Design a protein around this ligand. Structure first.
Ligand code: K
Ligand code: K
Ligand code: K
Ligand code: K
Ligand code: K
Ligand code: K
Ligand code: K
Ligand code: K
Ligand code: K
Ligand code: K
Ligand code: K
Ligand code: K
Ligand code: K
Ligand code: K
Ligand code: K
Ligand code: K
Ligand code: K
Ligand code: K
Ligand code: K
Ligand code: K
Ligand code: K
Ligand code: K
Ligand code: K
Ligand code: K
Ligand code: K
Ligand code: K
Ligand code: K
Ligand code: K
Ligand code: K
Ligand code: K
Ligand code: K
Ligand code: K
Ligand code: MG
Ligand code: MG
Ligand code: MG
Ligand code: MG
Ligand code: MG
Ligand code: MG
Ligand code: MG
Ligand code: MG
Ligand code: MG
Ligand code: MG
Ligand code: MG
Ligand code: MG
Ligand code: MG
Ligand code: MG
Ligand code: MG
Ligand code: MG
Ligand code: MG
Ligand code: MG
Ligand code: MG
Ligand code: MG
Ligand code: MG
Ligand code: MG
Ligand code: MG
Lengths: 102, 229
RNA sequence: GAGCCUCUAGUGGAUGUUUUACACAUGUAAGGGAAUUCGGCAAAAUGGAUGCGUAACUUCGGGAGAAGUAUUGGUUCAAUUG
RNA sequence: CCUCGUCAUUUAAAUGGUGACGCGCAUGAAUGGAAUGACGAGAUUCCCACUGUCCCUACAUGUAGACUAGCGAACCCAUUU
RNA sequence: UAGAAAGCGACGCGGCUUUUUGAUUCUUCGAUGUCGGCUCUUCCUAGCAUGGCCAUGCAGCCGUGGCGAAGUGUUGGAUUGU
RNA sequence: GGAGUGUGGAUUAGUACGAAAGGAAACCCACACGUGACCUCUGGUGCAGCGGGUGUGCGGAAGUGCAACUGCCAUGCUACGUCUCCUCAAGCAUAGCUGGAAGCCUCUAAGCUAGAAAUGAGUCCUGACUCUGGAAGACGGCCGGGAAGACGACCCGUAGUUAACAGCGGUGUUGUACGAUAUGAGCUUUCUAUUGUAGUAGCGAGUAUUUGAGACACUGGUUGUUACCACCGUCGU
RNA sequence: CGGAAGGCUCAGUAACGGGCGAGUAUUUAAUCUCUAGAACCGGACAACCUCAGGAAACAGAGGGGAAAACGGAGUAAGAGCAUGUGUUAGCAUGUGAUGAGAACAACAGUGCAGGAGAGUAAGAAGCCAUCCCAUCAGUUAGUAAGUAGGGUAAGGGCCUAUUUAGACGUAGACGGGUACGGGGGAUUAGGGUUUGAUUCCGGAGAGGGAGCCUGAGAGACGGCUACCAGGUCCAAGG
């Protein structure tokens, strides 16, 4: 069981520890400890705090969502699937055409 | 939660409900992730699936390039997914969308089966379908006409394809026979009109070029007469 | 010839023990901010230089650093006191 | 004196402060009377900033203090308490 | 509202208390530190709240007069040395 | 010696009661003040530990003194945190039962019943005089520690899962060591051979790699090495 | 291809807001006159087909398929720069970034690429006239100018760097108050005094401020985006 994920550090927070801070902007935000809340107030950018999970991902020391570079699975050619023309007949027509073309 | 499965070798579709444990094993994934069918059902070993997209329960779409578990508002143009502009060019509008990361928000996930292997998934494997339209363009038609890298009159190929339809489909019949037509190949009406443009340029040249000499016969001192304003 | 740090020249003893409470010299403090007390007593806050901008009243000299605001380290350059 | 005088303003609340009023127990003109500026470690009231003064106390440092070696007094005392 | 006595009780009469201020000068003038606040403990009852009851001009709600009872409570501020 | 005290909400109920308007009565749950403890969490504190900068010292860098400033933070201590708090017996005032005096009546003259946050016990803290047991040796000092502490006293250990140093596992705190190497807003044009070619550089804040590095602690886990078997007194048979 | 016109109002503005001349330092889809075009290849988007989300408003997957729509190839053409020669077109020579293109129907026609000149519309400019208060006398520092560059369709402190101290005022500067401006209206012997929101022309706005895509042309609101002031529907999520 977890309480959530810390906003600044990126660290997952155990059940029964940490605190929520609610701003007048109406947002609610979860912090691991007083240490990282204070660093937010003082406008220290998280990417510079080298032990944070955020910083390590940004540097590429840890594999993260940005590294993945996924692409759509490529398929192959089919026996010409076209309206009316039954799949099997084209398997035959294509051959017959290839013959005549030679 | 629904799951919507497409099988692109067959052209077939099926929708199923998931159970809790199946659902909870999908959480954390994103579009263009892959998994093995064994994680959704018992059996289905070695069937590889890819995640395509889906919908929030509020109805907002999942977007392929917004890597978060949250809703945002984005300014969207024509050609962006999630927006369909119509009555003014250059229109752009701000709409709510959801990030790609899967969680309890989602009502439906779309999935493609890459290969059914030895398995017999109902409805996906039991049917094979084709396309909806026919290649109008000549070279697209030719490839389908089975030929390659040889020269024909379109009539030959139209004859081949029509005869094959009569034979292979109907074994004789007036059914089928969709209204096949060909683009990007010169018909006789085009041969004439394309000859005529050659006639135009050849005369317009000679006529223009004549008058120059005809002028110079009369006016040797063209420049000295004209220029003194 | 301030405070802080060094060169020349000069300097030191009632013994051991980690040592409660109450003291005397000092530090720091969530949320609140004089509710404390005869009384803000004590403490905190402000602080140098450069620029912008400065009221009532006045014996016309002053008030005046009024008030109120912004800037300031290291490096590598231009320009010569800006 | 009566007296914490009456009316207005300052506070949630004013035996306080400032502004008015005046038959003033017992104000008043070099026994000097009245209105201001600049300057007071002078007396008094309010506001902003600031805070362990307070709600309500907690923790930590140095030096004494407890215990130990060497050295070594005084105030006071009818005393059986 | 009838009616002495639910509640009151004129004109008169008998007591108790030492928490007010007097009255007196017994003890201390070769010295018993004098007002108020702060802090902290214990006692008294002539009972304000909280518990059990009786009367009522006690319908109910809210009260008023009395009885046994001293276990637990009785605050934060403004002006002023009070 | 002594300890729990009070308030509110919901339900009875818009009910009884009243012409109407209005308008009551257990059990359960939340809280405040008081009492006794406790650090798992959250605040606070910074002695041990890791980092940063200013002025000036040890020729430079590295390691660092003094004046003092500053970010984080083990163990511990603490409240602004968390847990805690009822049951018998005899009976007051009163209201009653039976019942004479006094053929009737009557709570009272004998006798009996219900009865208060009050009284006396138990559960809670202190612990007088006692009681039951083992054995010819017992006990104290000296040596080393703490969960205990002003000093005594208390809880413990002394040839062993004993202590201390190292590996190798484990659990934390700080934030990425020294040295190399590469880059860097810009600024610059030096040298050797030798006539003309070739060789051919300097100065620089910072940033990235090697490197969740390096430092520091604790381990009731496991291996190696090293040290320790005494002595003095009192009472008894 | 049009939705940038017409319709409504007079808040703001003492000013390129108004009258008269002139045609540039500029850009202009349509339309006119003259002239004027040998080009190959590839995917998608919407609708269609199969699933299928959401309270609604509004959207998803997967697979075909067109153009005179779109992107690439060659190729004509071709900005700027430099020197000759003709102000100035044009021509010569060197160097070159860039880089395209529509046909179709016969009721007998309708379109579309390039140039040069017109035509329409804007942008910027010249001269002259413009209300009250002195109980408002000094105002300004991109302010006044110069050199060089960036920017724009284009001249220019329009903006920026270094130099020069200018510019405007009792013939009323600067500040404040007030005002849509004319053609015109009412009164009138003559000289005057008063008014003009209101058929024509030109300007500005779309609750108040600010930014913007598309296009030949908007800083557009019967287009988009954010704040401030107000509202409407919900199944509470929009
Ligand atoms: K801290
Ligand atoms: K359309
Ligand atoms: K000196
Ligand atoms: K000095
Ligand atoms: K005060
Ligand atoms: K006072
Ligand atoms: K004092
Ligand atoms: K004067
Ligand atoms: K002053
Ligand atoms: K008063
Ligand atoms: K007053
Ligand atoms: K007198
Ligand atoms: K006098
Ligand atoms: K006199
Ligand atoms: K003084
Ligand atoms: K200490
Ligand atoms: K000592
Ligand atoms: K005396
Ligand atoms: K005194
Ligand atoms: K009572
Ligand atoms: K009491
Ligand atoms: K704790
Ligand atoms: K702590
Ligand atoms: K030193
Ligand atoms: K802490
Ligand atoms: K009884
Ligand atoms: K007792
Ligand atoms: K014995
Ligand atoms: K010991
Ligand atoms: K390093
Ligand atoms: K590192
Ligand atoms: K819903
Ligand atoms: Mg504080
Ligand atoms: Mg604070
Ligand atoms: Mg007080
Ligand atoms: Mg002081
Ligand atoms: Mg006072
Ligand atoms: Mg007065
Ligand atoms: Mg006098
Ligand atoms: Mg007395
Ligand atoms: Mg004395
Ligand atoms: Mg005496
Ligand atoms: Mg005494
Ligand atoms: Mg009594
Ligand atoms: Mg320390
Ligand atoms: Mg051990
Ligand atoms: Mg118009
Ligand atoms: Mg109208
Ligand atoms: Mg107006
Ligand atoms: Mg093309
Ligand atoms: Mg300048
Ligand atoms: Mg008008
Ligand atoms: Mg407009
Ligand atoms: Mg607009
Ligand atoms: Mg409009």
């Amino acid at each position: 069981f977890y309480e959530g994920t810390c906003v600044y550090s990126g660290y997952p927070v155990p059940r029964g520890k940490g605190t929520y801070f609610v701003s007048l902007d109406d947002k609610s935000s979860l912090f691991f400890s007083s240490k990282y809340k204070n660093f937010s107030d003082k406008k220290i950018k998280a990417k510079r705090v080298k032990q944070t999970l955020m910083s390590k991902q940004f540097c590429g020391k840890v594999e993260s969502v940005h590294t993945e570079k996924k692409k759509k699975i490529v398929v192959q050619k089919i026996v010409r699937g076209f309206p009316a023309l039954p799949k099997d007949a084209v398997e035959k027509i294509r051959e017959q055409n290839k013959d005549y073309k030679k | 939660m629904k799951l919507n499965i497409s099988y692109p070798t067959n052209g077939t579709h099926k929708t199923f409900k998931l159970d809790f444990k199946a659902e909870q094993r999908l959480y954390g994934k994103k579009t263009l992730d892959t998994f093995d069918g064994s994680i959704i059902k018992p059996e289905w070993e070695g069937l590889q699936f890819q995640i395509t997209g889906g919908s929030d329960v509020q109805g907002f779409p999942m977007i392929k390039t917004l890597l978060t578990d949250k809703r945002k508002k984005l300014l969207l143009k024509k050609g962006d997914k999630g927006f369909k502009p119509v009555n003014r060019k250059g229109l752009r509008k701000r709409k709510t969308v959801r990030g790609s990361i899967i969680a309890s928000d989602i009502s439906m996930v779309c999935v493609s089966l890459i290969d059914a292997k030895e398995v017999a998934i109902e409805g996906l494997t039991d049917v094979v379908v084709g396309a909806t339209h026919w290649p109008k363009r000549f070279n697209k038609l030719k490839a389908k006409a089975g030929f390659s890298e040889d020269a024909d009159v379109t009539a030959e190929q139209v004859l081949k394809v029509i005869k094959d339809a009569i034979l292979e489909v109907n074994g004789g019949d007036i059914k089928k026979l969709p209204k096949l037509k060909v683009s990007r190949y010169q018909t006789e009406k085009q041969k004439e009109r394309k000859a005529e443009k050659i006639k135009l340029i050849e005369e317009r040249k000679k006529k223009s070029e004549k008058e120059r000499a005809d002028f110079l016969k009369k006016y040797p001192d063209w420049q000295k007469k004209f220029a003194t304003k």
